[PDB]
Amino acid sequence: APSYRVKRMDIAKNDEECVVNAANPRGLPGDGVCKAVYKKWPESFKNSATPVGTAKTVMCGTYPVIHAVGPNFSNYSESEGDRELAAAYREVAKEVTRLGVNSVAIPLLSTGVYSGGKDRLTQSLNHLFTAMDSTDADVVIYCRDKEWEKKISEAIQMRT
Ligand SMILES: O=C(O)c1ccnc(=O)[nH]1
After folding, report:
1. Is the Cβ–Cβ distance between 66 and 96 less than 8 Å?
2. What DSSP state is assigned to residue 11?
3. Which DSSP letter does residue 9 get?
4. How far apart are CA 90 and CA 128, in angstroms?
5. What domain count does the chain have?
């Protein structure tokens, strides 16, 4: 029976069969979060460039890295941002299904340096749910803040 779980820890130490990288459209290593993914799976960044609102899988050996590019809300309108953030998660669902994996480690896209200084926990998480509800993979959501862990954990609780 496929579950959603949340873990407050480095996504680069996930124990799922694949990872989603919160990526930039240039396929650049990045800093903070993407840096952890670059350091862990540097060969997954070969031709990882993909436009905003898309996802691209690059294998690191047999381990799939799904580069998913949420919008930078600094650059987008609230309405266009929202559209691009929905589409990014939909492309993630498609890659997870295509790969036939049983589990996936996923961050909340567009909630860090791409949030345009706003709190987007509920926006990002609902788009994730919309996309991943139609898949049969175990989903493990990774976050850093304890407050965020609690809020995500409750949003999971109150749909079961
Ligand atoms: O702000 C973020 O967490 C983020 C950085 C890069 N790509 C994203 O989808 N999101």
Report:
1. yes
2. G
3. S
4. 8
5. 1
CA atoms within 13 A on the CB side of 44: 30
Q: Using what technique was this structure determined?
A: X-ray
81's enclosing H/E stretch is helix 78-99
Tell me if residue 55 falls in helix, strand or coil. strand
β partners of residue 65: 19, 58
CA of 29 to the centre of ligand 1 (A): 12
Residues in Cβ contact with 120 at an 8 Å cutoff, skipping those fewer than 6 apart: 73, 85, 108, 110, 111
Residues near ligand 1 with C-beta < 6 Å? 22-24, 69-70, 109-115
Nearest residue CA, atom 3 of ligand 1? 112
CA of 111 to the centre of ligand 1 (A): 6
This structure's resolution (Å) is 2.1
